[PDB]
Coordinates of C-alpha atoms and ligand atoms in Angstrom, one line a residue:
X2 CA 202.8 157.3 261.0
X3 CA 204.2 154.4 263.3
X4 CA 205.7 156.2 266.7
X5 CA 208.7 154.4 268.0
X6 CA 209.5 155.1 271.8
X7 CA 213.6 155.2 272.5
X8 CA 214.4 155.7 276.3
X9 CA 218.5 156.6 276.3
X10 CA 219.8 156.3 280.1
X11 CA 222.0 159.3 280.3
X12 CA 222.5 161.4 276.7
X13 CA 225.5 163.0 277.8
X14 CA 227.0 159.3 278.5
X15 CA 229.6 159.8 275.6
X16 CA 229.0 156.4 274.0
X17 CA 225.2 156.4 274.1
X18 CA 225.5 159.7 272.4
X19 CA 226.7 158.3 269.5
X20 CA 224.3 155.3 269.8
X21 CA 221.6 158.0 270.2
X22 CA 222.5 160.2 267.3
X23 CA 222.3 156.6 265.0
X24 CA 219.5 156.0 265.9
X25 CA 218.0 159.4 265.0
X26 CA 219.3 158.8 262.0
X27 CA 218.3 155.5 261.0
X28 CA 214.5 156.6 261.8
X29 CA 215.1 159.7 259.9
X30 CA 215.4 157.3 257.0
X31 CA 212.0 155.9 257.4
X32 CA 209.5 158.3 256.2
X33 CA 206.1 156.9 258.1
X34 CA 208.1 156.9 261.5
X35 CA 208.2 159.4 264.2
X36 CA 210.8 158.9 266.8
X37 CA 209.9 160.0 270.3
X38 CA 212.7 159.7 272.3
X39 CA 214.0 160.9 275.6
X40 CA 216.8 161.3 278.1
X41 CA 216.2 159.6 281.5
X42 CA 218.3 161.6 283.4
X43 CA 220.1 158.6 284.7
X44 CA 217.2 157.9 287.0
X45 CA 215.0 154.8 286.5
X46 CA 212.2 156.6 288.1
X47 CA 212.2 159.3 285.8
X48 CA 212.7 156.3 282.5
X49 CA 209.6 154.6 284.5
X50 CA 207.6 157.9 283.9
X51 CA 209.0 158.3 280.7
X52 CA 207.6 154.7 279.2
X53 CA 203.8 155.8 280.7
X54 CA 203.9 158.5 278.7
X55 CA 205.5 156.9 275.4
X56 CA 202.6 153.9 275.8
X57 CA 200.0 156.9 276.4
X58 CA 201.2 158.0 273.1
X59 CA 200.4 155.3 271.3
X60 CA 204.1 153.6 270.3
X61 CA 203.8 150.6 268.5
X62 CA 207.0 149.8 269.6
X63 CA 209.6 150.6 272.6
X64 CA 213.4 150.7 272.1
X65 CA 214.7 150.6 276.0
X66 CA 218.1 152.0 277.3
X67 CA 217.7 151.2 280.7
X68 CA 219.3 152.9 283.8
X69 CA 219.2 149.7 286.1
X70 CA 219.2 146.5 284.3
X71 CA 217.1 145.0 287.3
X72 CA 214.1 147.2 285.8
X73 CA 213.2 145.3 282.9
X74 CA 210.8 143.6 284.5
X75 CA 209.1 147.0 285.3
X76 CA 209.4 148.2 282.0
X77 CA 208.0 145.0 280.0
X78 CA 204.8 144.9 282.5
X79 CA 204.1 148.5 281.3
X80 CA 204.8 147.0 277.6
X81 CA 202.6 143.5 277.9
X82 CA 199.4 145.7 279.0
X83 CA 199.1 147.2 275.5
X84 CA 200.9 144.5 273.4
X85 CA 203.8 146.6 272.9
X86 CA 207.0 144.9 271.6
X87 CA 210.5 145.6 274.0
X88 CA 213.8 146.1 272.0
X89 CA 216.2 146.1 275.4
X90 CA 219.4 147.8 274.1
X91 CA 223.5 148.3 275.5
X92 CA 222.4 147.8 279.1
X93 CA 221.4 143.6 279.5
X94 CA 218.3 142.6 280.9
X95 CA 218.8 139.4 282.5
X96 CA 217.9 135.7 280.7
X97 CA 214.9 135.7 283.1
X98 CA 213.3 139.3 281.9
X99 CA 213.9 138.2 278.2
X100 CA 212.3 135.0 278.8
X101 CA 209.5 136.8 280.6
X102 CA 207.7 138.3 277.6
X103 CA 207.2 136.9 274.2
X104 CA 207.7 140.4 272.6
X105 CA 210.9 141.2 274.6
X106 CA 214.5 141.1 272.4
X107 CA 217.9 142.4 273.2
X108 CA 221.1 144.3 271.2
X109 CA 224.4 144.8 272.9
X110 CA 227.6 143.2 272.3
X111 CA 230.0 140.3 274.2
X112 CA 231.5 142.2 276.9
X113 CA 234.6 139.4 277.7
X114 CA 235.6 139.9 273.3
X115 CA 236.3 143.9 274.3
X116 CA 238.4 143.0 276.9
X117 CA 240.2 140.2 275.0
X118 CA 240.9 142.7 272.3
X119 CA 242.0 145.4 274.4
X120 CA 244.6 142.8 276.0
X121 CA 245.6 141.6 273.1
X122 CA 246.1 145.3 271.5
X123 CA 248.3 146.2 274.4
X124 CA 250.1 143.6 274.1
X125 CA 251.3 144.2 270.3
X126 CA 251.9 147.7 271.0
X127 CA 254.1 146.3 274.5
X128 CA 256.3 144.6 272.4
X129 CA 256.7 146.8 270.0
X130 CA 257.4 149.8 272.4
X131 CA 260.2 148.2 274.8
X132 CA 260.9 152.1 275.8
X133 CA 257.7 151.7 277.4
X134 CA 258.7 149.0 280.6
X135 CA 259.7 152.0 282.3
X136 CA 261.3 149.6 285.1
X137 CA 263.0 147.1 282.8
X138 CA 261.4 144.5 284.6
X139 CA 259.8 142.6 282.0
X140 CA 256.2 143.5 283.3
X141 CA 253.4 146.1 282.7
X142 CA 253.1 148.2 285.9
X143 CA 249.7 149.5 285.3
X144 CA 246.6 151.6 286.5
X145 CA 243.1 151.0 285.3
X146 CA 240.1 153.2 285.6
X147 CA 237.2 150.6 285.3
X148 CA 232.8 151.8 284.5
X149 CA 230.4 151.3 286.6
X150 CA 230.6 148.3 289.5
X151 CA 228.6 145.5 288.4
X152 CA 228.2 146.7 284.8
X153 CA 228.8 143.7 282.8
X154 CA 230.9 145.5 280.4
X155 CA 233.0 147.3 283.4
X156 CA 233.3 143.7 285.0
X157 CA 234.7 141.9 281.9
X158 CA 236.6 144.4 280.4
X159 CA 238.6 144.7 283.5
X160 CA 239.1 141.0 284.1
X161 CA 239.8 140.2 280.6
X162 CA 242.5 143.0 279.2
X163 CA 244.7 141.5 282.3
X164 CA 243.7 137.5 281.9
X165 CA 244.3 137.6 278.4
X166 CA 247.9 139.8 278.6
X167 CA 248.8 137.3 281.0
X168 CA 247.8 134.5 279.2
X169 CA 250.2 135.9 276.8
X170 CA 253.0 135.5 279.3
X171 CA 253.1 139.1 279.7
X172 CA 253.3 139.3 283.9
X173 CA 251.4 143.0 285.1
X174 CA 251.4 144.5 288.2
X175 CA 248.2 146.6 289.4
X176 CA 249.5 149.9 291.0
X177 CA 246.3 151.7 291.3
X178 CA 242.8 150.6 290.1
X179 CA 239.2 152.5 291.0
X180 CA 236.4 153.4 289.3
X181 CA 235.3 156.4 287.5
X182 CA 231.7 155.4 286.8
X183 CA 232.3 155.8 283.0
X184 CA 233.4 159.6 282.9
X185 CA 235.6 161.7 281.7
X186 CA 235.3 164.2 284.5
X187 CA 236.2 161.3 287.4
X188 CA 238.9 159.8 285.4
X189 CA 240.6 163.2 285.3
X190 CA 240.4 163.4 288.9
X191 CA 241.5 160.1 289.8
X192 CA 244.3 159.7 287.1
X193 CA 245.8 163.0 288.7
X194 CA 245.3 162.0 292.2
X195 CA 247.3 159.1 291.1
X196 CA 250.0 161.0 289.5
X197 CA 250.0 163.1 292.8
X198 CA 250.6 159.4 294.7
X199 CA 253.4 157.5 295.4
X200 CA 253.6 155.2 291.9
X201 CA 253.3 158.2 289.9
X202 CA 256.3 157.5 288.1
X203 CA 256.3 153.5 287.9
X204 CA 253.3 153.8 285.9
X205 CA 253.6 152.4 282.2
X206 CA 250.1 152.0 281.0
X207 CA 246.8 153.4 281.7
X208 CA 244.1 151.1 280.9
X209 CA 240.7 152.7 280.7
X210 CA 237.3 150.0 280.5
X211 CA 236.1 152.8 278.0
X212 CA 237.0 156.4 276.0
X213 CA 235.4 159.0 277.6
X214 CA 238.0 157.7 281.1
X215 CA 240.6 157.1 278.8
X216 CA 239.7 161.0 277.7
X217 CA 240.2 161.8 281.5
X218 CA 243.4 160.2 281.8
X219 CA 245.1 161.8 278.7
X220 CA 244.1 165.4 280.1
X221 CA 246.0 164.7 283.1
X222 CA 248.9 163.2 282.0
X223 CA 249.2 165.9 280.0
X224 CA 248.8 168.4 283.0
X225 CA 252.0 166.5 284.4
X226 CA 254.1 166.8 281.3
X227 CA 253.4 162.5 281.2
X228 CA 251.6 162.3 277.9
X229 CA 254.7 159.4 277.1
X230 CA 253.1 157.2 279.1
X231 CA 250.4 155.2 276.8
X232 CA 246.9 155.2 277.7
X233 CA 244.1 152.7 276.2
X234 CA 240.3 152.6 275.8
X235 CA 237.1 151.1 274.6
X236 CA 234.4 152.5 272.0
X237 CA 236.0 154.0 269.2
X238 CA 233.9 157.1 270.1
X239 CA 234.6 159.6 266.7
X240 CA 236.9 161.8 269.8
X241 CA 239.1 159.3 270.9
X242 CA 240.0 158.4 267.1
X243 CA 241.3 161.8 266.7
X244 CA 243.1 161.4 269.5
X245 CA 244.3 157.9 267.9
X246 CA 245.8 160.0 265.1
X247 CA 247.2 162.5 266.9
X248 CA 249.1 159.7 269.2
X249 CA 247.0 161.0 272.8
X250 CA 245.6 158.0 272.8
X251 CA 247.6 154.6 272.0
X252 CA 244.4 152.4 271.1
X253 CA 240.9 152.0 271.5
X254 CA 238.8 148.9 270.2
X255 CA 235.2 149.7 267.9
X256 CA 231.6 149.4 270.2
X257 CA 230.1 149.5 267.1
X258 CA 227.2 152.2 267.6
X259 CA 226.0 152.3 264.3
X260 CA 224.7 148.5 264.0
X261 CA 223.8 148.5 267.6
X262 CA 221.7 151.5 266.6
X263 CA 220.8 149.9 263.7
X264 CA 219.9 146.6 264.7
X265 CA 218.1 148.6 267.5
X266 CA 215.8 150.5 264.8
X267 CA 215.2 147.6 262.5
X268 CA 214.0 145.1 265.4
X269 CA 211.7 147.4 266.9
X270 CA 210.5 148.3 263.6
X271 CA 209.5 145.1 262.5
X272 CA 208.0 144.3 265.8
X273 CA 205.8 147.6 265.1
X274 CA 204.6 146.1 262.4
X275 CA 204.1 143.2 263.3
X276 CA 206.7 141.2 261.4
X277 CA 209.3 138.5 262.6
X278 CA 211.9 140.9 264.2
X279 CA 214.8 140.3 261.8
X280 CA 212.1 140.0 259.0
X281 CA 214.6 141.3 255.6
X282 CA 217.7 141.9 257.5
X283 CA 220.7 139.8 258.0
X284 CA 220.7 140.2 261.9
X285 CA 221.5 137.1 263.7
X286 CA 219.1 136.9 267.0
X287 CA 220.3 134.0 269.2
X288 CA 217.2 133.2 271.6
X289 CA 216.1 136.9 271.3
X290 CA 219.9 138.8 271.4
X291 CA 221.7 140.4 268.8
X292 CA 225.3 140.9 269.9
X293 CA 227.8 143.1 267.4
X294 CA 231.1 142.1 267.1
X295 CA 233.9 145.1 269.0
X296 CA 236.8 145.4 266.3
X297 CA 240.7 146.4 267.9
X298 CA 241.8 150.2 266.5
X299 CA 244.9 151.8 266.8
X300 CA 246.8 154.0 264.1
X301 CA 248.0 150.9 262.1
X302 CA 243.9 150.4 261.1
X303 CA 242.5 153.7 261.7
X304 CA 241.1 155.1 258.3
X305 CA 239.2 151.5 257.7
X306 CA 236.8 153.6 260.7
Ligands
BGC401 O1 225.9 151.3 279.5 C1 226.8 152.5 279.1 C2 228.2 152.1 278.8 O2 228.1 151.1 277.8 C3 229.4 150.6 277.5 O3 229.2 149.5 276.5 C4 230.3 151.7 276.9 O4 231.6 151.1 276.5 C5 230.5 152.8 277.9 O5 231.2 153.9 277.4 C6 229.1 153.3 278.4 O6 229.3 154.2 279.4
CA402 CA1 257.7 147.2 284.0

């Protein structure tokens, strides 16, 4: 049996629990592999630990979900000492570290297209809902709980859902923005501090660089008797599409887990055996990347999810 070693940074990180739970299942579907895979805890030291032991087992393959991006190089000097192939997945090693080992491949997305999309979401649901400009000013007052600092996907989503609204000539004015390092738990806080501050009620829209914030913010809002005020995300996570339905949520745009997951699996299982990493798949790999296209969701599209 050919043993496949998956790092995931943090399982309880809501996204890369969906990634994770994929992945189980596209490995389930290939009878000679056993998956070894494990939760690092959100600690690259404890990943680093985890990757010894995953090489001392014998993986012909390594599928890596890093904690900090700036340990690639770490991880694929483990790797190159036994010849073992590195599929880098949702957290980007830089063009350097790819470049560094011939064996080394990447799966994630274009961070700047979720951001576009989110923008451009907002702004068909903006015009649609003119109840929604609170003020009557013409302008989205907004607040926007952004990931991690210097996660690419943080960075770009945040810069992009406002440059591409105001590209649109739709002016918006930031009344609060902070982040809530991806979770649910801090966007809750920090969307009811904010609805315990001072532009409580100018706030129109709550824009959320992913779900599980976006989950925060609803609970809050509702806590204030606010749930009118529309609140957006990223990931399509199976939750927040419920919540799409039900109308907590006003939109969300697709980080397509399953073909990250999937691309994932069949790279690193060609590079177990050997094989050309897209070898019988129609995965595109530009200069060793696979990026999956994010796709805009909100109750108009839902059930095509
Ligand atoms: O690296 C982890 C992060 O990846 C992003 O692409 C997701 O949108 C976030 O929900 C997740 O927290
Ligand atoms: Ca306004």
């Amino acid at each position: 049996d050919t043993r496949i070693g998956v790092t995931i940074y943090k399982y309880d990180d809501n996204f890369m629990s969906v990634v994770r739970k994929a992945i189980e299942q596209d490995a389930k579907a290939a009878p000679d592999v056993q998956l070894l895979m494990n939760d690092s805890q959100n600690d690259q030291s404890k990943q680093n630990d985890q990757i010894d032991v995953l090489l001392a087992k014998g993986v012909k393959a390594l599928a890596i979900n890093l904690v900090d991006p700036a340990a690639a190089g770490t991880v694929i000097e483990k790797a190159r000492g036994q010849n073992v192939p590195v599929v880098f997945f949702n957290k980007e090693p830089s063009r350097k570290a790819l470049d560094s080992y011939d064996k080394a491949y990447y799966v994630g997305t274009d961070s700047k297209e979720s951001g576009i999309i989110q923008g451009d979401l907002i702004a068909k649901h903006w015009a649609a809902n003119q109840g929604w400009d609170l003020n009557k000013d013409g302008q989205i007052q907004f607040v926007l709980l952004k990931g991690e600092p210097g996660h690419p996907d943080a960075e770009a989503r945040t810069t992009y859902v406002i440059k591409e609204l105001n590209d649109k000539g739709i002016k918006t004015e930031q009344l609060q923005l902070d982040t809530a390092m991806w979770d649910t738990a801090q966007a809750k806080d920090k969307m009811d501090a904010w609805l315990s501050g001072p532009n409580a009620n100018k706030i129109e829209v709550v824009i959320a660089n992913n779900d599980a914030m976006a989950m925060g913010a609803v609970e809050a809002l509702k806590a204030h008797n606010k749930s009118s005020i529309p609140v957006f995300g990223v990931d399509a996570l199976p939750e927040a599409l419920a919540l799409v339905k039900s109308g907590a949520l006003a939109g969300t745009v697709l980080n397509d887990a399953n073909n990250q997951a999937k691309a994932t699996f069949d790279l690193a299982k060609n590079l177990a055996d050997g094989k050309g990493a897209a070898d019988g798949t129609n995965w595109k790999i530009d200069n060793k990347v696979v990026r999956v296209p994010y796709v805009g969701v909100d109750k108009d599209n839902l059930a095509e999810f």
